């Protein structure tokens, strides 16, 4: 595998992974916006032949009413290349990128209830905590957990 | 509640007034910047001023224009840059 | 007025007239010397004008102005110093960039790009052990990268393979959770140490149960003996495992779960799929099915063993049940849609893809709104395979249309990117939008597009919106076809099929110097490509047969370039030399057998004599070439041969039983 | 607990046909689709069991009201041949026992079984399912046309 930084000329194929892996689809101008505004926190996982196999496209949510924090928008990898320890490596590389560039107080995402493997991986291994159950989030009609993770211990481990 | 980034690009196009920087003696820099800029402008002017006195024949130019299909400006550059001869100019456009 | 000149600057950076934008931006400078956007424009302009060493001191004296402001925030000048180290890195001034980041390392907030700048400048300036410490710090930083490990390899400069693998053995010891340190020794190593390394690698990845490990090992199936020793090792594992319920009766460990048996059966079944013997693959996947009928990946490779064979419909009917096991993720029904489109089923693939889409419109328009290039290009190729052209030509036109949209999109954010302070991703996306049309999906659509335009021209019968029956029946397809082909020709040239379709699209226009320069730019890369070789054959065939119907200016240059590249020979002996130097290559043999009938139709008895050889010593003898030789036999380019094609397909069906194109009708 | 790879799982709306494909093959009789409609809305009362993250076992149950009691009947047990005593029966049968005990307001549990599989009734009598009823000609097309009924009480 390979985990590396978000070069913009790559990212216009990882949307091809989006349309092939997870149903929540986005506009490409969203990708060109979050490829220039914060290029550090989003990462791309590849294999040898240059084919895209996984990505994290993330976001630092700008909110002046409280402390600044991050917001994971998309995590995906292919089912043909799964169960190798990809998603946790991409997620904590993105987390350490956030804590090394602009001090992420907490991270947050939204995940549906019907999936079990992703729910397990966010739940016990990478240790998210369920903070709010938001009703009727996705289009197909499933309620979604709004998960959060505290990164103060990660901040004091990377500050040493 | 899913917005799909509708308000993400709205404040990209917002109106704002940009900041002001205190003037502190930039003239000593921009003097040598303008001198270097006038040097490359003198070179880039001297290119077209030395190659401006080149005769142009019409039939060979229209034959090249029929046979490789670009605009007239780049073909005129390529024909003035090859000393008015058609053959090695066609070789260089073929290379 | 200032808005008119800002609009002029944006429309001149739109149409890429560079120094006019520079002149009107120096008009802003003698209008006002204090804006940042002038300095951003100067940085991007002399990055794309490639003058760097003076831009070094110019960005230094711009850095001088912004340090004294009391209301200032740190991230902008941090990435400004990063863009400065980037432009001094590409400047060639290596010691200057090194001393600059050593002086301004403490004025940052991003350690990452400062660290790669130090690493690359320590790779460049020959300093070895400090760069080794830098890349050890990167390995402790990120344990997973090709470039970091390769830079550490070429920095430490290993004398032999053993000291090279010592690096990955110590990387095994302190970092056991990583993946590519368990993989990179399997690339270059050979022998018994390679055998005993892959042994414990697949033992761990089969005890834990990693599916795509075969995918990693299909990076290394270009060697012959490695495949044989892996296959002998795996069959030894199972012949020991179905007798005493362990990997081998030498050691004594904890007894494995019984899923390991079917998991290794899965691995070897896909291994027999790769080496091209599907009979043993069925004989073992039958026991794999009778062990457990419920896991998805076993039936997925049950589809793949038929997809790599000829028959595509059996793969479709097994794989529809395989995806009908669960309806949770978009991956398995996306591959179901792909396999149904390659199974010559359009309505079932449409109703299959329409499940996970939004239920407010049709499926194809919904994936057109979200720019699904994959489905559109692949069903365009499938609709070409249904032997009619209209909506495939339509889909090629609208994928190039949203290419026009994605190349026009950039006008909106430049005010925010002169309001924000980020420059190196900005110069990289301006650099990508210079060269945006080099993506392989565009070429994958354009090759079948140009193919159907030339096939339609050779054998004839609130912007613009498309209906197929008017838009497929343009009175001359060639001028709009070369309009769609010319960015593919101007932007990417390292692949020979671009210039070869340029040859095929100039063959019916008869522009002979464009013809010959596409010949030259295709010949400068590869000279022994067969389809390019018969392009050469038709080239000097029409040269020696049409040396009189052209003007005197083209005569001299055509003759001297032909003297340069070609010489003076006939087609017959040249094709004879070509068929003798490729006397074992079956696509090259078909390629010569085409022109041995084309140059003279009376030698057709030789052609069947030339393209019927079937011995085991042939290179690249798969079902692709056999389907190609029967398709080229029935295309009529070689002759009408219904007296030997039946015995040739009856002989090929005995060597390939599981193909649908070799079934007896 | 450690070293083993057993986890239970809920029957969701998207995972119906895998439940179909397992219980078409684990037991030789097959019933119509309203069985599979009945096993859906019960929620946490009917679940399946994954060994090494592939589906192996299943238990679905019902609620009965007959013979002056408020009764529970486990509808089917599901398991395969080469996986015996390797991760199916004991632990998720104890799971249906402890959901029955975390509710605890019911009377009894009971089961129908064939007469020919003596290892099965041994494995049920390892937990306390005593034999009280031997019904004659209960099965309709199989060779052991007879059946036993096993039962434990709660209160
Ligand atoms: C926007 C959002 O994030 S939510 C809405 C969309 N969400 C997503 O797209 C993410 C989930 N979607 C996917 O398609 C997933 O990526 C999947 C299904 C391919 C799974 O991805 P994976 O590559 O298997 O993740 P990963 O590489 O980390 O798997 C390894 C680890 O995952 C964990 N894991 C969690 N669940 C399981 C499970 N059922 N089985 C096996 N491992 C699991 C384990 O800790 C495992 O480690 P192990 O080898 O010691 O057992
Ligand atoms: O990576 P891409 O260029 O987008 O295409 C690949 C490739 O298909 P093509 O080479 O025909 O374009 C693979 O084909 P193979 O080389 O593996 O035979 C295919 O896998 P299969 O056809 O074998 O099923 C699948 O690759 P993967 O399954 O790893 O994603 C597919 O990817 P896409 O679905 O994105 O097109």
Tab-separated table of C-alpha atoms in Angstrom, chain C residues 29-436:
chain	number	residue	atom	x	y	z
C	29	UNK	CA	1.725	48.198	-9.001
C	30	UNK	CA	2.148	51.790	-10.201
C	31	UNK	CA	-1.470	52.225	-9.114
C	32	UNK	CA	-0.770	50.746	-5.660
C	33	UNK	CA	2.318	49.009	-4.197
C	34	UNK	CA	0.757	47.426	-1.093
C	35	UNK	CA	-1.571	44.619	-2.217
C	36	UNK	CA	-0.657	40.988	-1.668
C	37	UNK	CA	-2.335	39.775	-4.875
C	38	UNK	CA	0.353	41.447	-6.981
C	39	UNK	CA	3.002	39.404	-5.170
C	40	UNK	CA	0.915	36.227	-5.513
C	41	UNK	CA	0.557	36.969	-9.233
C	42	UNK	CA	4.300	37.572	-9.515
C	43	UNK	CA	5.058	34.271	-7.764
C	44	UNK	CA	2.687	32.261	-9.952
C	45	UNK	CA	3.834	34.065	-13.124
C	46	UNK	CA	7.556	33.512	-12.662
C	47	UNK	CA	6.806	29.992	-11.545
C	48	UNK	CA	5.096	29.381	-14.889
C	49	UNK	CA	7.731	31.497	-16.690
C	50	UNK	CA	10.539	29.412	-15.062
C	51	UNK	CA	12.794	32.142	-13.621
C	52	UNK	CA	13.570	31.192	-10.033
C	53	UNK	CA	16.917	32.520	-8.763
C	54	UNK	CA	15.812	36.171	-8.833
C	55	UNK	CA	12.361	35.246	-7.499
C	56	UNK	CA	14.312	33.965	-4.469
C	57	UNK	CA	15.437	37.443	-3.389
C	58	UNK	CA	12.131	38.969	-4.542
C	59	UNK	CA	10.167	36.687	-2.233
C	60	UNK	CA	12.722	37.477	0.499
C	61	UNK	CA	12.010	41.202	0.174
C	62	UNK	CA	8.289	40.418	0.181
C	63	UNK	CA	8.793	38.392	3.379
C	64	UNK	CA	10.540	41.497	4.777
C	65	UNK	CA	7.365	43.616	4.564
C	66	UNK	CA	4.924	41.348	6.422
C	67	UNK	CA	6.924	40.631	9.598
C	68	UNK	CA	6.167	44.010	11.232
C	69	UNK	CA	2.350	43.891	11.203
C	70	UNK	CA	0.877	43.501	14.723
C	71	UNK	CA	-2.461	41.959	13.612
C	72	UNK	CA	-0.928	38.989	11.816
C	73	UNK	CA	-1.699	35.257	11.774
C	74	UNK	CA	0.940	32.587	11.402
C	75	UNK	CA	-0.225	29.895	8.946
C	76	UNK	CA	-0.031	32.172	5.891
C	77	UNK	CA	3.602	33.182	6.270
C	78	UNK	CA	4.436	29.601	7.314
C	79	UNK	CA	3.206	28.236	3.983
C	80	UNK	CA	4.790	31.287	2.319
C	81	UNK	CA	8.166	30.135	3.655
C	82	UNK	CA	7.269	26.642	2.420
C	83	UNK	CA	6.540	27.972	-1.084
C	84	UNK	CA	9.843	29.855	-0.845
C	85	UNK	CA	11.714	26.641	-0.031
C	86	UNK	CA	9.878	25.026	-2.963
C	87	UNK	CA	10.938	27.702	-5.463
C	88	UNK	CA	14.527	27.694	-4.151
C	89	UNK	CA	14.468	23.883	-4.373
C	90	UNK	CA	13.510	23.996	-8.050
C	91	UNK	CA	15.881	26.958	-8.564
C	92	UNK	CA	18.989	24.777	-8.460
C	93	UNK	CA	20.301	26.906	-5.577
C	94	UNK	CA	20.624	23.973	-3.177
C	95	UNK	CA	22.944	25.318	-0.466
C	96	UNK	CA	20.943	28.574	-0.508
C	97	UNK	CA	17.666	26.737	0.153
C	98	UNK	CA	19.396	24.586	2.784
C	99	UNK	CA	20.720	27.571	4.739
C	100	UNK	CA	17.388	29.375	4.311
C	101	UNK	CA	15.293	26.640	5.894
C	102	UNK	CA	17.985	26.150	8.548
C	103	UNK	CA	17.593	29.853	9.392
C	104	UNK	CA	13.772	29.988	9.189
C	105	UNK	CA	12.794	26.546	10.501
C	106	UNK	CA	11.495	28.080	13.754
C	107	UNK	CA	9.015	30.477	12.077
C	108	UNK	CA	6.619	27.734	10.954
C	109	UNK	CA	3.557	25.812	12.043
C	110	UNK	CA	3.893	22.887	9.605
C	111	UNK	CA	6.772	20.530	10.430
C	112	UNK	CA	5.896	18.221	7.519
C	113	UNK	CA	6.965	20.050	4.355
C	114	UNK	CA	9.914	21.676	6.167
C	115	UNK	CA	11.002	18.132	6.994
C	116	UNK	CA	10.672	16.844	3.407
C	117	UNK	CA	12.533	19.946	2.192
C	118	UNK	CA	15.395	19.102	4.567
C	119	UNK	CA	15.265	15.447	3.496
C	120	UNK	CA	15.429	16.203	-0.223
C	121	UNK	CA	18.192	18.805	0.181
C	122	UNK	CA	20.172	16.294	2.251
C	123	UNK	CA	19.648	13.669	-0.448
C	124	UNK	CA	20.867	16.182	-3.026
C	125	UNK	CA	23.996	17.581	-1.321
C	126	UNK	CA	25.623	14.124	-0.804
C	127	UNK	CA	25.424	14.210	3.036
C	128	UNK	CA	24.614	10.626	3.982
C	129	UNK	CA	24.161	9.792	7.680
C	130	UNK	CA	22.259	12.969	8.585
C	131	UNK	CA	19.833	12.168	5.749
C	132	UNK	CA	19.690	8.610	7.117
C	133	UNK	CA	18.606	10.038	10.482
C	134	UNK	CA	16.049	12.211	8.641
C	135	UNK	CA	14.518	9.174	6.943
C	136	UNK	CA	14.572	7.184	10.194
C	137	UNK	CA	12.588	10.088	11.638
C	138	UNK	CA	10.223	9.751	8.680
C	139	UNK	CA	9.865	6.010	9.296
C	140	UNK	CA	8.965	6.782	12.908
C	141	UNK	CA	6.698	9.538	11.515
C	142	UNK	CA	4.890	7.450	8.884
C	143	UNK	CA	5.568	3.677	8.794
C	144	UNK	CA	4.015	3.296	5.335
C	145	UNK	CA	5.478	4.847	2.159
C	146	UNK	CA	7.334	3.763	-0.963
C	147	UNK	CA	9.311	6.994	-1.369
C	148	UNK	CA	10.623	7.159	2.211
C	149	UNK	CA	11.866	3.555	2.232
C	150	UNK	CA	13.330	3.918	-1.269
C	151	UNK	CA	15.128	7.111	-0.250
C	152	UNK	CA	16.511	5.357	2.826
C	153	UNK	CA	17.679	2.474	0.597
C	154	UNK	CA	19.446	4.725	-1.900
C	155	UNK	CA	20.850	6.842	0.951
C	156	UNK	CA	22.368	4.029	3.033
C	157	UNK	CA	23.622	2.364	-0.227
C	158	UNK	CA	23.553	-1.355	0.676
C	159	UNK	CA	26.490	-3.436	-0.493
C	160	UNK	CA	24.622	-6.733	-0.823
C	161	UNK	CA	21.036	-8.013	-0.537
C	162	UNK	CA	21.526	-9.291	3.029
C	163	UNK	CA	22.387	-5.890	4.501
C	164	UNK	CA	19.494	-4.497	2.441
C	165	UNK	CA	17.047	-6.946	4.035
C	166	UNK	CA	18.514	-6.226	7.496
C	167	UNK	CA	16.735	-2.849	7.269
C	168	UNK	CA	13.395	-4.541	6.744
C	169	UNK	CA	14.117	-7.153	9.431
C	170	UNK	CA	14.729	-4.442	12.029
C	171	UNK	CA	11.627	-2.690	10.653
C	172	UNK	CA	9.796	-5.967	11.341
C	173	UNK	CA	11.112	-5.928	14.907
C	174	UNK	CA	10.230	-2.409	16.043
C	175	UNK	CA	7.165	-1.986	13.759
C	176	UNK	CA	5.285	-5.311	13.518
C	177	UNK	CA	1.906	-3.778	12.616
C	178	UNK	CA	2.969	-2.297	9.272
C	179	UNK	CA	2.311	-3.977	5.942
C	180	UNK	CA	4.846	-2.954	3.255
C	181	UNK	CA	7.889	-3.877	5.451
C	182	UNK	CA	6.482	-7.407	5.212
C	183	UNK	CA	6.076	-6.913	1.435
C	184	UNK	CA	9.170	-5.071	0.067
C	185	UNK	CA	11.543	-8.031	0.756
C	186	UNK	CA	9.362	-10.124	-1.572
C	187	UNK	CA	10.065	-7.869	-4.577
C	188	UNK	CA	13.795	-8.411	-5.178
C	189	UNK	CA	14.796	-11.459	-3.128
C	190	UNK	CA	15.178	-14.911	-4.670
C	191	UNK	CA	15.909	-18.381	-3.360
C	192	UNK	CA	15.370	-20.330	-0.154
C	193	UNK	CA	15.343	-17.149	1.944
C	194	UNK	CA	12.611	-15.813	-0.364
C	195	UNK	CA	10.723	-19.096	0.105
C	196	UNK	CA	11.014	-18.974	3.899
C	197	UNK	CA	10.038	-15.289	3.948
C	198	UNK	CA	6.881	-15.798	1.875
C	199	UNK	CA	6.159	-18.887	4.011
C	200	UNK	CA	5.768	-16.940	7.255
C	201	UNK	CA	4.172	-14.011	5.374
C	202	UNK	CA	1.301	-16.071	3.968
C	203	UNK	CA	1.157	-18.092	7.207
C	204	UNK	CA	0.458	-14.899	9.169
C	205	UNK	CA	-1.909	-13.482	6.537
C	206	UNK	CA	-3.845	-16.775	6.391
C	207	UNK	CA	-4.004	-17.226	10.164
C	208	UNK	CA	-5.393	-13.696	10.486
C	209	UNK	CA	-7.413	-13.993	7.265
C	210	UNK	CA	-6.466	-11.205	4.854
C	211	UNK	CA	-8.324	-11.513	1.502
C	212	UNK	CA	-6.307	-9.341	-0.965
C	213	UNK	CA	-2.885	-10.874	-0.203
C	214	UNK	CA	-3.055	-12.646	-3.598
C	215	UNK	CA	-3.411	-9.175	-5.124
C	216	UNK	CA	-0.119	-8.187	-3.505
C	217	UNK	CA	1.392	-11.410	-4.784
C	218	UNK	CA	0.057	-10.775	-8.275
C	219	UNK	CA	2.601	-7.993	-8.412
C	220	UNK	CA	5.236	-10.763	-8.464
C	221	UNK	CA	3.799	-13.286	-10.946
C	222	UNK	CA	6.030	-12.188	-13.836
C	223	UNK	CA	8.676	-14.734	-12.770
C	224	UNK	CA	8.248	-18.431	-13.545
C	225	UNK	CA	9.922	-20.376	-10.719
C	226	UNK	CA	8.480	-18.207	-7.924
C	227	UNK	CA	4.965	-19.152	-9.071
C	228	UNK	CA	5.949	-22.835	-9.151
C	229	UNK	CA	7.457	-22.868	-5.658
C	230	UNK	CA	4.495	-20.914	-4.210
C	231	UNK	CA	2.049	-23.352	-5.833
C	232	UNK	CA	4.001	-26.410	-4.634
C	233	UNK	CA	4.185	-24.882	-1.137
C	234	UNK	CA	0.424	-24.229	-1.008
C	235	UNK	CA	-0.532	-27.689	-2.286
C	236	UNK	CA	1.876	-29.144	0.282
C	237	UNK	CA	0.066	-27.125	2.969
C	238	UNK	CA	-3.291	-28.575	1.985
C	239	UNK	CA	-2.104	-32.163	1.452
C	240	UNK	CA	-0.708	-31.958	4.982
C	241	UNK	CA	-3.766	-30.115	6.331
C	242	UNK	CA	-6.468	-32.549	5.214
C	243	UNK	CA	-4.571	-35.425	6.897
C	244	UNK	CA	-3.416	-34.239	10.346
C	245	UNK	CA	-5.208	-30.853	10.648
C	246	UNK	CA	-2.119	-28.607	10.732
C	247	UNK	CA	0.140	-26.832	8.219
C	248	UNK	CA	2.909	-29.452	8.527
C	249	UNK	CA	3.539	-32.248	11.063
C	250	UNK	CA	7.027	-30.981	11.982
C	251	UNK	CA	6.154	-28.185	14.408
C	252	UNK	CA	3.513	-28.323	17.151
C	253	UNK	CA	1.424	-25.203	17.740
C	254	UNK	CA	-2.147	-24.314	18.549
C	255	UNK	CA	-4.659	-26.009	16.276
C	256	UNK	CA	-5.966	-23.685	13.579
C	257	UNK	CA	-9.606	-22.798	12.952
C	258	UNK	CA	-11.113	-24.893	10.130
C	259	UNK	CA	-11.749	-21.739	8.064
C	260	UNK	CA	-8.036	-21.911	7.146
C	261	UNK	CA	-8.699	-24.908	4.857
C	262	UNK	CA	-11.295	-23.126	2.714
C	263	UNK	CA	-9.247	-19.914	2.893
C	264	UNK	CA	-6.186	-21.607	1.386
C	265	UNK	CA	-8.553	-23.281	-1.123
C	266	UNK	CA	-9.745	-19.768	-2.054
C	267	UNK	CA	-6.125	-18.637	-2.483
C	268	UNK	CA	-5.085	-21.583	-4.654
C	269	UNK	CA	-8.296	-21.392	-6.711
C	270	UNK	CA	-7.489	-17.807	-7.624
C	271	UNK	CA	-3.889	-18.970	-8.212
C	272	UNK	CA	-5.104	-21.578	-10.720
C	273	UNK	CA	-7.181	-18.771	-12.236
C	274	UNK	CA	-4.020	-16.732	-12.794
C	275	UNK	CA	-1.839	-19.498	-14.281
C	276	UNK	CA	-4.552	-20.398	-16.778
C	277	UNK	CA	-5.752	-23.923	-15.919
C	278	UNK	CA	-9.440	-23.584	-14.990
C	279	UNK	CA	-10.197	-27.325	-14.759
C	280	UNK	CA	-8.271	-27.818	-11.504
C	281	UNK	CA	-9.735	-24.493	-10.336
C	282	UNK	CA	-13.256	-25.897	-10.753
C	283	UNK	CA	-12.213	-29.228	-9.185
C	284	UNK	CA	-11.069	-27.384	-6.042
C	285	UNK	CA	-13.676	-24.602	-5.945
C	286	UNK	CA	-16.357	-27.331	-5.979
C	287	UNK	CA	-15.025	-28.581	-2.635
C	288	UNK	CA	-14.783	-24.929	-1.563
C	289	UNK	CA	-18.494	-24.474	-2.378
C	290	UNK	CA	-19.479	-27.735	-0.656
C	291	UNK	CA	-17.601	-26.610	2.464
C	292	UNK	CA	-19.559	-23.374	2.915
C	293	UNK	CA	-22.123	-21.729	0.604
C	294	UNK	CA	-22.443	-18.369	2.322
C	295	UNK	CA	-19.341	-16.161	1.978
C	296	UNK	CA	-19.239	-13.542	-0.769
C	297	UNK	CA	-15.622	-13.535	-1.983
C	298	UNK	CA	-15.666	-17.239	-2.895
C	299	UNK	CA	-18.537	-16.661	-5.304
C	300	UNK	CA	-16.846	-13.444	-6.473
C	301	UNK	CA	-13.803	-15.414	-7.610
C	302	UNK	CA	-16.236	-18.042	-8.931
C	303	UNK	CA	-17.381	-15.214	-11.200
C	304	UNK	CA	-13.779	-14.199	-11.919
C	305	UNK	CA	-12.685	-17.695	-13.029
C	306	UNK	CA	-15.337	-17.552	-15.756
C	307	UNK	CA	-14.589	-13.903	-16.588
C	308	UNK	CA	-10.923	-14.735	-17.214
C	309	UNK	CA	-12.207	-17.637	-19.313
C	310	UNK	CA	-14.399	-17.053	-22.358
C	311	UNK	CA	-17.981	-17.567	-21.153
C	312	UNK	CA	-19.229	-14.339	-19.558
C	313	UNK	CA	-22.888	-15.251	-19.010
C	314	UNK	CA	-22.231	-18.016	-16.464
C	315	UNK	CA	-20.162	-15.488	-14.506
C	316	UNK	CA	-23.159	-13.138	-14.669
C	317	UNK	CA	-25.690	-15.688	-13.396
C	318	UNK	CA	-23.447	-16.847	-10.540
C	319	UNK	CA	-22.413	-13.298	-9.658
C	320	UNK	CA	-25.992	-11.993	-9.558
C	321	UNK	CA	-26.711	-14.523	-6.792
C	322	UNK	CA	-23.356	-13.623	-5.195
C	323	UNK	CA	-24.414	-9.985	-4.952
C	324	UNK	CA	-27.949	-11.088	-4.086
C	325	UNK	CA	-26.600	-12.508	-0.815
C	326	UNK	CA	-26.474	-8.991	0.681
C	327	UNK	CA	-27.513	-5.561	-0.627
C	328	UNK	CA	-25.485	-3.305	1.673
C	329	UNK	CA	-22.579	-1.777	-0.278
C	330	UNK	CA	-22.207	-0.137	-3.687
C	331	UNK	CA	-19.059	-2.106	-4.606
C	332	UNK	CA	-20.611	-5.491	-5.307
C	333	UNK	CA	-23.571	-4.256	-7.339
C	334	UNK	CA	-21.299	-1.826	-9.197
C	335	UNK	CA	-19.258	-4.842	-10.286
C	336	UNK	CA	-22.572	-6.607	-10.986
C	337	UNK	CA	-23.502	-3.758	-13.335
C	338	UNK	CA	-20.082	-4.012	-15.012
C	339	UNK	CA	-20.378	-7.786	-15.459
C	340	UNK	CA	-23.926	-7.479	-16.820
C	341	UNK	CA	-22.803	-4.828	-19.317
C	342	UNK	CA	-19.987	-7.129	-20.423
C	343	UNK	CA	-22.505	-10.006	-20.467
C	344	UNK	CA	-24.509	-8.185	-23.218
C	345	UNK	CA	-27.422	-7.270	-20.918
C	346	UNK	CA	-28.439	-3.600	-20.804
C	347	UNK	CA	-31.859	-3.528	-19.102
C	348	UNK	CA	-30.840	-5.835	-16.239
C	349	UNK	CA	-27.715	-3.741	-15.626
C	350	UNK	CA	-29.869	-0.591	-15.707
C	351	UNK	CA	-32.380	-1.914	-13.165
C	352	UNK	CA	-29.503	-3.269	-11.066
C	353	UNK	CA	-27.642	0.052	-10.942
C	354	UNK	CA	-30.902	1.912	-10.241
C	355	UNK	CA	-31.229	0.478	-6.645
C	356	UNK	CA	-28.781	2.634	-4.661
C	357	UNK	CA	-29.429	5.775	-6.713
C	358	UNK	CA	-31.923	8.482	-5.809
C	359	UNK	CA	-35.522	7.546	-6.608
C	360	UNK	CA	-36.562	10.908	-8.065
C	361	UNK	CA	-35.288	10.394	-11.613
C	362	UNK	CA	-33.862	7.779	-13.964
C	363	UNK	CA	-30.565	6.040	-13.252
C	364	UNK	CA	-28.435	7.254	-16.173
C	365	UNK	CA	-29.405	10.924	-15.753
C	366	UNK	CA	-28.742	10.698	-12.001
C	367	UNK	CA	-25.244	9.333	-12.568
C	368	UNK	CA	-24.774	11.982	-15.275
C	369	UNK	CA	-25.573	14.663	-12.683
C	370	UNK	CA	-22.894	13.278	-10.338
C	371	UNK	CA	-20.402	12.821	-13.226
C	372	UNK	CA	-20.069	9.023	-13.207
C	373	UNK	CA	-17.491	8.585	-15.957
C	374	UNK	CA	-17.035	4.840	-15.350
C	375	UNK	CA	-20.567	3.600	-16.099
C	376	UNK	CA	-20.965	5.891	-19.112
C	377	UNK	CA	-17.692	4.948	-20.822
C	378	UNK	CA	-18.111	1.249	-20.074
C	379	UNK	CA	-21.699	1.072	-21.339
C	380	UNK	CA	-20.573	3.075	-24.375
C	381	UNK	CA	-18.080	0.293	-25.103
C	382	UNK	CA	-20.845	-2.267	-24.467
C	383	UNK	CA	-23.181	-0.390	-26.824
C	384	UNK	CA	-20.435	-0.489	-29.441
C	385	UNK	CA	-20.381	-4.242	-28.777
C	386	UNK	CA	-24.117	-4.275	-29.624
C	387	UNK	CA	-23.033	-3.186	-33.177
C	388	UNK	CA	-24.711	0.258	-33.315
C	389	UNK	CA	-23.287	3.655	-32.613
C	390	UNK	CA	-25.744	6.405	-31.697
C	391	UNK	CA	-26.024	6.781	-27.939
C	392	UNK	CA	-22.409	5.655	-27.475
C	393	UNK	CA	-21.358	8.608	-29.650
C	394	UNK	CA	-23.766	10.699	-27.546
C	395	UNK	CA	-22.134	9.585	-24.280
C	396	UNK	CA	-18.660	10.302	-25.659
C	397	UNK	CA	-19.860	13.811	-26.516
C	398	UNK	CA	-21.301	14.496	-23.068
C	399	UNK	CA	-18.269	13.113	-21.227
C	400	UNK	CA	-16.172	15.546	-23.249
C	401	UNK	CA	-18.804	18.178	-22.360
C	402	UNK	CA	-18.346	17.751	-18.612
C	403	UNK	CA	-14.623	17.740	-19.314
C	404	UNK	CA	-15.249	21.227	-20.777
C	405	UNK	CA	-17.129	22.098	-17.578
C	406	UNK	CA	-14.363	20.768	-15.291
C	407	UNK	CA	-11.802	22.748	-17.329
C	408	UNK	CA	-13.948	25.908	-17.099
C	409	UNK	CA	-14.823	25.599	-13.381
C	410	UNK	CA	-11.798	27.415	-11.924
C	411	UNK	CA	-13.038	31.009	-12.391
C	412	UNK	CA	-14.880	31.148	-9.057
C	413	UNK	CA	-12.207	30.683	-6.376
C	414	UNK	CA	-9.369	33.025	-7.419
C	415	UNK	CA	-10.775	35.883	-5.317
C	416	UNK	CA	-10.685	33.629	-2.250
C	417	UNK	CA	-7.222	32.377	-3.255
C	418	UNK	CA	-5.943	35.944	-3.435
C	419	UNK	CA	-7.777	36.629	-0.129
C	420	UNK	CA	-6.240	33.438	1.395
C	421	UNK	CA	-2.460	32.716	1.503
C	422	UNK	CA	-1.853	29.284	-0.073
C	423	UNK	CA	0.365	29.077	-3.147
C	424	UNK	CA	1.974	25.684	-3.873
C	425	UNK	CA	-1.309	23.827	-4.252
C	426	UNK	CA	-2.482	26.828	-6.280
C	427	UNK	CA	0.414	26.598	-8.728
C	428	UNK	CA	-0.091	22.822	-8.808
C	429	UNK	CA	-3.748	23.096	-9.757
C	430	UNK	CA	-3.008	25.740	-12.389
C	431	UNK	CA	-0.390	23.264	-13.625
C	432	UNK	CA	-2.961	20.449	-13.666
C	433	UNK	CA	-5.549	22.569	-15.494
C	434	UNK	CA	-2.872	23.180	-18.113
C	435	UNK	CA	-2.662	19.396	-18.628
C	436	UNK	CA	-6.049	18.161	-17.343
